[PDB]
Amino acid sequence: MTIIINVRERIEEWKIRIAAGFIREGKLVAFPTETVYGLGANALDENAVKRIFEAKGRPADNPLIIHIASFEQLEVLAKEIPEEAEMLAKRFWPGPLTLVLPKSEVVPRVITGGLDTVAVRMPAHEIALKLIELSERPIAAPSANISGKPSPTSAHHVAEDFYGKIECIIDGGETRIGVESTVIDLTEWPPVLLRPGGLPLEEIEKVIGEIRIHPAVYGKSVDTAKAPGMKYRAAPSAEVIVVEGPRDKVRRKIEELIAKFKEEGKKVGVIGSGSYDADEVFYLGDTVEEIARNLFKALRHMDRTGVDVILAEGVEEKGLGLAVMNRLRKASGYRIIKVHHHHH
Numbered sequence: 001m002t003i004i005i006n007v008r009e010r011i012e013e014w015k016i017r018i019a020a021g022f023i024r025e026g027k028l029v030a031f032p033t034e035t036v037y038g039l040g041a042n043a044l045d046e047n048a049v050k051r052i053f054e055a056k057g058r059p060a061d062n063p064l065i066i067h068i069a070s071f072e073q074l075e076v077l078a079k080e081i082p083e084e085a086e087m088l089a090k091r092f093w094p095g096p097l098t099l100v101l102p103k104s105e106v107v108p109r110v111i112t113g114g115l116d117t118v119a120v121r122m123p124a125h126e127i128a129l130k131l132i133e134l135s136e137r138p139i140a141a142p143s144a145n146i147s148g149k150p151s152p153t154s155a156h157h158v159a160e161d162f163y164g165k166i167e168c169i170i171d172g173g174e175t176r177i178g179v180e181s182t183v184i185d186l187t188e189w190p191p192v193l194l195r196p197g198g199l200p201l202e203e204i205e206k207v208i209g210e211i212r213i214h215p216a217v218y219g220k221s222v223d224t225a226k227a228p229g230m231k232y233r234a235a236p237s238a239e240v241i242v243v244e245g246p247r248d249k250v251r252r253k254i255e256e257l258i259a260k261f262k263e264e265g266k267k268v269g270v271i272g273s274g275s276y277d278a279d280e281v282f283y284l285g286d287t288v289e290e291i292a293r294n295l296f297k298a299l300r301h302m303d304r305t306g307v308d309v310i311l312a313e314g315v316e317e318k319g320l321g322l323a324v325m326n327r328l329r330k331a332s333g334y335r336i337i338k339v340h341h342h343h344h
């Protein structure tokens with residue numbers, strides 16, 4: 001079924017036109033973005049959108065983010081746009097920021113999982129914008145993965161999940177940030193962070209004041225998702241353990257745990273910076289930015305190699321690290337080992 005369009009070098013418009021044609025015809029198109037790859041459909045066409053949920057096997061109440069290329073499009077999808085929304089748009093769009101607002105009647109309820117609110121974003125990616133421009137349609141698009149697998153950050157990840165199952169994949173290379181957009185709820189004062197992501201909280205806080213963090217960012221079970229990445233948490237075949245604390249103590253803890261799970265005859269994977277004696281070891285990088293960029297790539301490598309346990313080194317809950325920790329903590333099922341410097 002699928003047509004793959006390599007655009008990772010030059011961005012020929014006639015190629016993007018192929019994909020834009022598929023969006024118009026109510027078909028599915030996977031496309032790169034600065035955050036992760038998205039599985040897009042015409043957000044105006046309710047049955048096209050249904051096909052996203054079906055392809056992914058995604059719960060109907062996990063809503064979808066609508067991608068736009070101009071600000072006049074936000075006016076069509078939302079009503080009651082507050083001023084703090086305009087400030088954030090002006091400063092951070094196009095960018096890894098998603099706003100939740102009151103929806104207008106033009107947004108089908110299948111996008112919003114039944115709710116009166118809609119999640120909108122203007123992606124900072126030439127390919128994603130050009131597709132939206134040439135489709136002349138707003139594009140509904142969660143992450144382009146089978147529900148339960150990790151998010152995709154390259155067209156390889158998309159293809160291993162959906163090649164032959166969806167109409168089109170646009171390959172624009174590995175995504176630069178690597179974790180999903182940040183989501184702010186501007187449906188109430190004060191605003192509330194629903195999902196930490198590509199735009200760090202400190203940045204947002206320079207523009208609008210301090211904001212509330214929704215308890216979902218820290219694990220708490222939510223039964224209604226106002227935004228994606230809040231309620232579901234299949235995002236694995238392996239036990240995942242996160243080790244947090246001072247570096248030298250974490251690395252020592254991981255060492256004991258590799259031995260322990262090998263003693264139980266199990267295949268051990270480790271993600272982090274230390275040198276370890278494991279079956280599989282992915283080096284994620286020195287900085288938090290590099291970590292976010294390689295996170296999902298790493299987790300997909302661990303699922304491919306069929307390791308029984310994944311041991312991850314924590315990172316500082318700061319900059320991109322709030323997000324990388326949030327996604328790790330949602331994958332391991334918050335199985336965290338905290339090691340401390342002793343005070344006696």
Ligand SMILES: C[C@@H](O)[C@H](N)C(=O)O
Pocket residue numbers: 033035036037038039065098121123141142143144179180181182
């Ligand atoms: C696909 C990508 O745009 C994703 N929905 C995000 O918000 O990061």
